[PDB]
Structure formats: C-alpha cells, structure tokens
Amino acid sequence: MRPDLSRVPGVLGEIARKRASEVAPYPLPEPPSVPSFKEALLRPGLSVIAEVKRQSPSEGLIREVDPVEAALAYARGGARAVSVLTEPHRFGGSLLDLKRVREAVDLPLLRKDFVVDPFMLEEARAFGASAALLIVALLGELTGAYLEEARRLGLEALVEVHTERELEIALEAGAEVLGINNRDLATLHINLETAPRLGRLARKRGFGGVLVAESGYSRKEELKALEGLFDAVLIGTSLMRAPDLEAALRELVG
C-alpha cells in the first residue's frame, strides 16, 4: 500500500511525489547474504555511518567524487556502516551506486532514499542493502506496515523521526534502529538540539534499540555530547566536502 503524500510539505513532499511517479516494479534477483546493520552499530563507542552522495541539497558545494572511492576511504577511516544515496533528482544518486559500493566494501549498507512504495524495499534487499531508510514524515501511520514488510524481506530499517509525535509512531512500530534527524526535510533547516532532545525521550520511553543521530555534524565536540546516549551518528556532507575523506573521518573518531 502506498502512503498518501498529498499533504507532505516542502522539499520532502516534492521529492517524495516525484519518486512515487517513477516507481515501476521490475524483475529482481534473489537476495544475497548481507551483514547486520544493527550489530555493526552496537560496537564500542559512538558508531559512525558515513554517507556517500554526489550532491548536497542543503549545503551544495560537493565537488566531483566517486561513491566507491569515498566508501573505501570511509571504511579505512573507521566508519562502521555506509549510507548510499540512491535518490536521483536532488542527491544525484542512483541504485547503481548502491550496487557498486556493495561490491567494493564489506561494511553493511543503508539505502538512503525516499521509500514511498513497498517495491523500493524489495529492491534494496535484492541488491545488497542491509537496511533501508523509512521516513515517518512520509509514511505516517503506515510506518509499521513498511517496517514489517522489511522484516519479511529480511531487511533492516533506519526508522527516521524528527518530532515527538513521529517518535511515538516509530516506537510503537517496533523500530530496532531509530534515527533522529536534526534537519527538517520540509524546509531543510537544521537544529542540532533535536537529536539529543528526542533521543533522551526515546530512552525514557523505554527504547532499548540502536539510537542514531542524523544530519549537520562536522566536528568531534558535537559528537562528544552524543556519547552515553546515542549508539551511532550519520554523517555525510561535512566529510564529502573535506580535502581527504579518510583523514576527516579519523579526526571525527578520535
């Protein structure tokens, strides 16, 4: 079942409706063996999910780079998982990028896209993604149905929330890996206080799974504040824009 995207506001809404218009089921290969996304993030200390993407809608200025070379650099630099943008119109990504990275590294991969149809989940798993992004701002109360579909497919999910209301939806759906986005996908405005605030609430509400802080991070001090609360942090643009990806990442790990 497809979510009603008629009322999704701003940029998020526009991106989502376009994706929904180009969704067309096609023959998929049998699912390959993939590592656990959740397990990699549960390793000691704040785990970094390094994100690869050729274009940044919020900050731009992403010079020419190769998703594979970036992924290899990230791995060597200490990333525990890699997020691959497969959204084509605003992030300049593609499913091919996911396939390529999958062939190059051993780290678990997250398909970063705007899932608006169950086929996108089947597709992600079929091509080697360990997990797929589920945005509560898009799926609404259908978040649980999509998460279950992922389970049936043997696919994990990074359930992304931005509000207290969305958090409750994610918690009731049984999310195991929960992400808090500091960025408002409708306006693209960033608020670094969002992750800590809602992360704390998640734990207080009994969430015992993997907590992931997302967006806007660029320096170690910001990460230090997440220790003891979050299990992981998703970082992309600040790395993609650095002179040397591996070096910038090593400094973030410390």
Automatic annotation (TrEMBL):
Keywords: Amino-acid biosynthesis, Aromatic amino acid biosynthesis, Decarboxylase, Lyase, Tryptophan biosynthesis. It catalyses: 1-(2-carboxyphenylamino)-1-deoxy-D-ribulose 5-phosphate + H(+) = (1S,2R)-1-C-(indol-3-yl)glycerol 3-phosphate + CO2 + H2O. GO terms for molecular function: indole-3-glycerol-phosphate synthase activity; phosphoribosylanthranilate isomerase activity. InterPro entries: Aldolase_TIM, Indole-3-glycerol_P_synth, Indole-3-glycerol_P_synth_dom, RibuloseP-bd_barrel. Its EC number is 4.1.1.48. It comes from the Bacteria. Residues 32-252 form the Indole-3-glycerol phosphate synthase domain. One of its GO terms (biological process) is L-tryptophan biosynthetic process. This is indole-3-glycerol-phosphate synthase. It comes from Thermus thermophilus.
